[PDB]
Amino acid sequence: NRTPRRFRSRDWFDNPDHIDMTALYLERFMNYGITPEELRSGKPIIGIAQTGSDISPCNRIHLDLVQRVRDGIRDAGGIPMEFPVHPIFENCRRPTAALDRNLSYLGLVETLHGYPIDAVVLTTGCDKTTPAGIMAATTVNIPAIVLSGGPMLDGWHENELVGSGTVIWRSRRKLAAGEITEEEFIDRAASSAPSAGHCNTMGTASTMNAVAEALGLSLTGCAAIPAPYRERGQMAYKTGQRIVDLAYDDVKPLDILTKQAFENAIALVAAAGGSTNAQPHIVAMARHAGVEITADDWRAAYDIPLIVNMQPAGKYLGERFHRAGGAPAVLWELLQQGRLHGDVLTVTGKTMSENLQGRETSDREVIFPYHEPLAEKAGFLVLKGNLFDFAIMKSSVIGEEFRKRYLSQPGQEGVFEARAIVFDGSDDYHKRINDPALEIDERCILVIRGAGPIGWPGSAEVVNMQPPDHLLKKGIMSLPTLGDGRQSGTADSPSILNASPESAIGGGLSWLRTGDTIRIDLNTGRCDALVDEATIAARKQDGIPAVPATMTPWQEIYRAHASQLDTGGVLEFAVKYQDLAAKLPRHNH
Amino acid sequence: RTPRRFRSRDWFDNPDHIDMTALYLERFMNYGITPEELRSGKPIIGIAQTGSDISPCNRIHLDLVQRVRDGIRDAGGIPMEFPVHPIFENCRRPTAALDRNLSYLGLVETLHGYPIDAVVLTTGCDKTTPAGIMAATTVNIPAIVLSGGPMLDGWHENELVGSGTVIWRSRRKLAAGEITEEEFIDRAASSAPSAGHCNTMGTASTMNAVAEALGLSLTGCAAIPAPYRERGQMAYKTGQRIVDLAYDDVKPLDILTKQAFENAIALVAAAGGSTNAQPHIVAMARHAGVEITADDWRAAYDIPLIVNMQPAGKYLGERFHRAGGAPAVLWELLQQGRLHGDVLTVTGKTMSENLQGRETSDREVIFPYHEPLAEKAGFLVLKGNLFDFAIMKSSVIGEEFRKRYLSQPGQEGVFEARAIVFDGSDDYHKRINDPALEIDERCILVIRGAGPIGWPGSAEVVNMQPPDHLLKKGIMSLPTLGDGRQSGTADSPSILNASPESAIGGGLSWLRTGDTIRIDLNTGRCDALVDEATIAARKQDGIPAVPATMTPWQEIYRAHASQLDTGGVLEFAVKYQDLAAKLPRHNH
Amino acid sequence: RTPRRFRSRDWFDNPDHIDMTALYLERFMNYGITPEELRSGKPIIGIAQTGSDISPCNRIHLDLVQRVRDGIRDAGGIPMEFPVHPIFENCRRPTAALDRNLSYLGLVETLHGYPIDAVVLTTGCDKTTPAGIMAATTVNIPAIVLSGGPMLDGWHENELVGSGTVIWRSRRKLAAGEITEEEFIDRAASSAPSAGHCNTMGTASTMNAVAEALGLSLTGCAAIPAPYRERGQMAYKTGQRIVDLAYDDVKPLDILTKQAFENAIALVAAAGGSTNAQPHIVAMARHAGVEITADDWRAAYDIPLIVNMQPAGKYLGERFHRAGGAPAVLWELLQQGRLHGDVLTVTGKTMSENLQGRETSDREVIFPYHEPLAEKAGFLVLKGNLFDFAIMKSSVIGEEFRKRYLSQPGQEGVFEARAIVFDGSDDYHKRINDPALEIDERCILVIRGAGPIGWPGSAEVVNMQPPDHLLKKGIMSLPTLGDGRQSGTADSPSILNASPESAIGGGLSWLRTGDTIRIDLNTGRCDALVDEATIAARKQDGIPAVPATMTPWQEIYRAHASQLDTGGVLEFAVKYQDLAAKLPRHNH
Ligand code: FES
Ligand code: FES
Ligand code: FES
Ligand SMILES: [Mg+2]
Ligand SMILES: [Mg+2]
Ligand SMILES: [Mg+2]
Questions:
Q1: Is C64 in Cβ contact with A33 (below 8 Å)?
Q2: C520: Cβ contacts below 8 Å, ≥ 6 apart
Q3: Which atom of ligand 2 is nearest to the CA of C27?
Q4: What is the 8-class DSSP label of residue C349?
Q5: Bond before B311 cis per omega within 30 degrees
Q6: List of chain C residues whose C-beta atoms are within 8 Å of the C-beta of residue A68
Q7: Other CB atoms within 10 A of residue A218 CB
Q8: Which helix (H) or strand (E) element contains residue C47?
Q9: Cα(B392)–Cα(B378) distance, integer angstroms
Q10: From CA A130, how far away is CA A54, in angstroms rounded?
């Protein structure tokens, strides 16, 4: 198995030319008890990028699991080095945690490339830490492997399942409809988080962790294990064993993250009822590995049926999903219908197909068979028009009442027209949504603008807007929704999302006005404002709607270099840098 | 916050011996504690840590302890974590029942010998809960129990698989050749999915509920599964409360009255608890100076089964907790006047006030008293010419068993069985499938030499299964009798804890294979049909052999341990009471 | 290396019991251990953890245990950490001496009753080193000692303050009024500047040096200050080497020969070690089935004082380590043919190959054997009519003491003094300055009722200081005699460990205040000049009283502890040897 190699660590700890610098490098790494024989025996230094902390409750389980990773690395013959990254906690980070993925990315590459690190174990959980980690590891391109934290346990409130995130959106409706009070709202929310781990619905965190499995970047079965199961700590051990293997065999990210691998992830996202936030993230990771993912790569997957019976699209939560076989069971379903490139290489050292043998699900209540699924055409639906060149709609989440109301008229199905109610940001929506002067009814479409990477800044999860109270009290639970921002992966709103280019850089949403008529055609992928070419340029000369001034040093940088979610809201200058571990850096003294 | 003058101050602020105060304070600062911390007069809160790598059922406390410390600090105490002697019931051989008294001795020493004003007793695995309470009673400084909690539900092939109970059910399946040997090892592993203790209503679940029923933990502390966020929140609230108990000076002997033990006896019956609760409750009471007699157990025989949990019922710890846990069970008993609700608890309220609003939320799990899972779920006390005290696990009689033995016409509750006697569990596993014994469905399987003295430490070996050939005919259980114990996770309706045991000359010593036993659950009698003349002839042959004492502690144990009917205590130790009423000598 | 059937496999891989294998395996995985780990056949390495908040001298081990774990894993073993009974010498009352045998009992149970193949014994505070080694020997599985090391140097007003020694020096500065009560407390505080044990050549520093001397720990592991990175590097190395010892089956009884204890006895004398080493070394020897007699102590008497460390000398643990530590001190002993340099050690090499190259690098701290600090530094045994064994701390005889009592031009080393007799230390503090006693420079202060049965657990109360009026006259110390002990940090040339102690009828029971005692350091005699007739008449008046037994463990101790001369062991316990050669029964 193990044929020796001169790891880049050896350029610090056994440098041929400079023996002064070598001694300078060994000296302090021994100040808490590491012996010289450890740092000088030619074992690989395995970094562990720690994401858990008191400020990051979704990832904090990695504070206890890190010990299992250390044990794996040491049994298998490496030397572990745990170190931190910029923290990211989506629930409390303001203005939004989307700001942090790129900032964490920058700091991880500096560390991975700047220290005597050979391979890495990326610890992941909360929404944006999985892409931030993978993005950084590929730019540097040293052998990497993802270790997922896992979701929380099932939450219960009065004998009822209660999913993280989705409990907030359902409780916003019942509090408006006067069916719950302000303390039941807080208490149902608290019941949604019964343990350590990330959101327990199929939101961004469960999606991005299933993605890394589909991408072949973590061991089989890693994504779905709930954080407090001992399975998770066993998995953390085996991941520590595996990463030294990947260091010796020299299996880098750029060997794994081919376009075919990204197409596998795309397929998985759709079959699993995954989050629309997966789209900016999968593109961002693709770009940073020099792969181009286009709007046609998403249309490819639209006709994947929904097969996992998990909130927000379905019924159960992360525990039932993982007991049913989690991501490998979903991938197996797909592989059987030829929707997977089964011959890609994975960090297991086998091929996707080889990994998936035996992974047929064990709970058909939870993971449905491909041919008798839960819903057809569950993939994202990219939409085009005069309002934006690209956006996606959460097809997996169209309710049957929503279907009957808009997508069901006898001659024209999948097509409907609605009256725009436009809001400039989240605060705007909350202040005017119940203003009867706007006379809102069942044939309106709620529109929000200024919530993109530039407008907010960092795109914001504010598109899952709810009907005004008077409509909620009539039983109308959702109206169509559209905006240039995002929504929580836990939303059960069939929104049109991630509209690029956003309003704030002169996308079509900059000139739309309340009372206009929007025409949605889901058969053809088109969404248009019925507003003539002449009126359009009259509005355009009034200028772009206003957006808040820059507030922090990082926001100035972000607003300067961030792309649109079309291409993954990436630091556009940064994609250029590839395989940085090929060249060494200069000595520091 | 009065403040009072805590015994710790005799170490850290003694105005007689200033040299000693300097000597006592010096080293306690060598990891960064400031003098204001130890010299301000805040109480020192000992935390008795039971969790370790070798104690996986209690290891959750390695994490929880930081929540306890935060609560002590918020409330104005100074925490002081220290360990006790490790106990891990599954791997400790010859038996972990040796360890309960050894852990008692050490913990008494630590609490009395050091400047500790009040203790948080972390509990979990079988024996850790009585051992902590016994010790905290003898020293009698303010004390509170913090339970660890069960593991989460175990699943294998979409079936609920319970800690411990899987092993016994797997033993019957492997013998009937229905599962492989790596499948046995497999489903055992499926039953232990997380940190925590046995997720069935075993000894840990029973004993931790008993601590709640005694009044020694905050309401709802017993049942919270170990990995729940709620368990961490409970550990914080408990750290707060122990500081208060230090100031209000609420001590074990203030709480462990005869009524509180009667309440605990009610709950064990209602909850389908382990029969190992019987020795542990008699031990705890003795060390508190309270007498628990066989008639106190008989008083709880007619309490109905209330909780629908393996091994007696269906679900595991997670469902029991979500339906209300121990408070929901105590609420049921309170409504029927089966509880003394006026007793004081460590919450600062009476049991009755703690229980208001605690009616269950899930009647599939915690049945109503008046239409329950089954009636007469209490332990049934048996006596006769083979022992003066044994109990039968009533809550666990199945329908086939009640048909085959308990339903003789005109004579219901009385049956007779032909004894097949084994000396140790090795002897059982060697001759149970020897056809020479010609075992029928009307035999009683008997094991002896497994009590406190015989094994030594009583051993969980009485849940013997039928021979291979009976299991293939659909006979899943014969009646069983022994002077040892069984796992609280057992679903055998055994007659257990037979005192006096065979090794000190109880009736089991002269029983022979072939003898007939007449059991009658109406009279409470269990008697071998052998005439006094033949008994005498047999007695003269001497007592059957038991192994030689093999470690120093076994020798101490064999010399001082009492019989299970009196708690298996160190007999000399129960005379020691309220030790914190007297300060120890200075050490220099 | 060559594979082995470790005893753990009897749990994790049983041939005839797959049910028990599943039951033993399942819960050991509930915090993430994989089946590949517990079934691969790698040895299971116990780590006997002694640190905690209540044990500040050993607390360093809670951060070093990770180093130990990493080394066990780099070497192919599976680490299993677990606690023992906590011991903290400074605060434990009535004495930490009661704990050594208690800790001993629990660790035997743990090592024998669980699947442990080899153990690392973390040590530090006084009693933890003998207690560990005693238990590892009784069970006799491959063992190794990891020492926590002493605290950093203490400075107070630009002066070295040593742990412990600063207390006894301050008690004199307080009666002579040179310091206030609150600078006493700051002075003691300055003595403890970091983690670690006492930084003087007290019992901790002695016993860890004894451990290395016996070949039970790696070369140079003893004197490394706890906060040094050398100490975590040593813990890693120790984790590695214990795996090797497990495969090579290098058991305690292979190492602990009479030749090894003799090497230890030499090192103690040569280093000015604590008198407490004598009962601990005898205790370890007995548990190793080795006899160590008063003659073997005499054989070390004439060894010079080589180490310039408080109490006897000047420096503290830091300078001693920088000078090459116990290796340098053994190297001296080697070249003068005072070691058995070819005994086996847990290093693989023999003691001679261990010390090749270990000559001290600082002759200001470790002196050459032939131009030494002082001569005849070993303990000096004394027989007599007051006791059949005692020892005197020859190493701390100062200039004035030698002049005032040991320098009669006729017969040097003989003197006679008047006995002032106190019954326990409280008697001392309430009468030492009672002027009706007429105490002068020619009195001997005597304390009794302070042995194993008397106190109970021998107490450190013999280093009594002169009355206040003698201290103001410049007399810094008088002869001191007792059946108790004294801190190994004490600079008192006391006569200690008197067996038989008073409380069981030894000579000190009949001796009275005012009697004349004659000591002869040339014959090793100490006698109370009182005639046989007065002795018999005083015995009729009864042994002087002692406090009643107060805790359950005290009753066990008083009923089983031996005398300090035979090691203060539980005498019934030394007959148990090589326990790991028999397996315990299965628990279910
Ligand atoms: S808050 Fe971190 S996963 Fe949703
Ligand atoms: S083994 Fe610890 S509770 Fe059953
Ligand atoms: S107090 Fe622990 S070493 Fe002296
Ligand atoms: Mg999110
Ligand atoms: Mg048990
Ligand atoms: Mg001492």
A1: yes
A2: C411, C413, C414, C526
A3: 1
A4: S
A5: yes
A6: 32
A7: 29
A8: strand C44-49
A9: 9
A10: 19
**How many angstroms separate the CA atoms of C459 and C480, rounded?**
14
CB contact under 8 A, C229 and A31: yes
Q: Is A194 within 8 Å of B361 when comparing Cβ atoms?
A: no
Q: Which of B64, B4, B15, B12 is nearest to B34 (CA)?
A: B12
Å from CA of A474 to ligand 2 middle: 55
Nearest CA to ligand 2 atom 4: B198
Residues of A in contact with C73 (CB under 8 A): 71, 74-75
Query: How far away, in angstroms, is A570 Cα from ligand 4 center?
Result: 17
Residue of C52, C127, C197, C205 best suited for mutating to test ligand 3, as the one with most atoms within 8 Å of CB: C197
What burial letters (b/e) apply to B38-65, b meaning 16+ CB within 10 Å?
beeebbbbbbbbbbbbbbbbbbbbbbbb
The Cα–Cα gap between C507 and C50 comes to 38
Paired with B48 in beta bridges are: B82, B121
Cα–Cα distance, A347 to A351 (Å, whole number): 9
- With a Cβ cut-off of 6 Å, ligand 1 is lined by A 58, 90-91, 126-127, 198-199, 205
Classify burial at B536, counting beta carbons within 10 Å of its beta carbon; exposed 0-12, middle 13-18, buried 19 or more: exposed
HEC profile of B471-485? HCCCCCCCCEEECCE
Distances in whole angstroms, Cα of residue A67 to Cα of each of A239, A526, B390, C70, C137: 12, 52, 47, 11, 32
Work out the angle at residue B277's Cα, subtended by the Cα atoms of residues B271 and B278, and round it to the nearest 5 degrees.
115
- Run of H or E residues at A483: strand A481-483
Is B344 buried (19+), middle (13-18) or exposed (0-12) by CB count in 10 A?
A: middle
Ordered DSSP codes for B316-384: -HHHHHHTTHHHHHHHHHHHTT-S-TTSB-TTSSBHHHHHTT---S-TTTB--TTS-SBS--S-EEEBS
Peptide bond into C94 cis (omega under 30): yes
- Cα–Cα distance measured from residue B525 to residue B543, given in angstroms and rounded to the nearest whole number: 24
The reply to whether omega before B252 is within 30° of 0 (cis) is no
Tell me if chain A has a CB within 8 Å of the CB of B53. Answer: no
Strand A481-483, strand A444-449: pairing: parallel
Is residue A58 marked as binding?
yes
Half-sphere exposure of A4 (CA within 13 A, CB side): 5
d(CA B411, CA B521): 11
What is the distance in angstroms between the Cα of B118 and the nearest Cα belonging to chain C? 14
E strands in C200-307: none
Distance CA C344, CA C350 (A): 5
Q: How far apart are CA C211 and CA C137, in angstroms?
A: 13
**Residue A323: strand, helix, or coil:** helix
B423-454 burial, b at 16+ Cβ within 10 Å, e below that, comes to bbbeebbeebeeeeeebeeebbbbbbbbbbbb
**Preceding amide of B500 cis, omega within 30:** yes
Ion ligand 6 — residues with CB under 5 Å?
C 89, 126, 203
Q: Which residues contact C100 (CB under 8 A, 6 or more apart)?
A: C87, C127, C130, C131, C134, C280, C283, C568
A129 min Cα distance to partner chain B (Å)? 23
Test mutation, C91, C140, C462, chain B, max B CBs within 10 A: C91
Q: How far apart are CA B449 and CA B501, in angstroms?
A: 7
Residue C99: how many CB atoms within 10 A of its CB? 28
CA–CA separation, C268 vs C278, rounded Å?
9
* CB-based contact, C241 to chain A, within 8 Å: no
Gyration radius of chain C's alpha carbons: 24
Q: How far is CA B226 from the centre of its chain?
A: 18
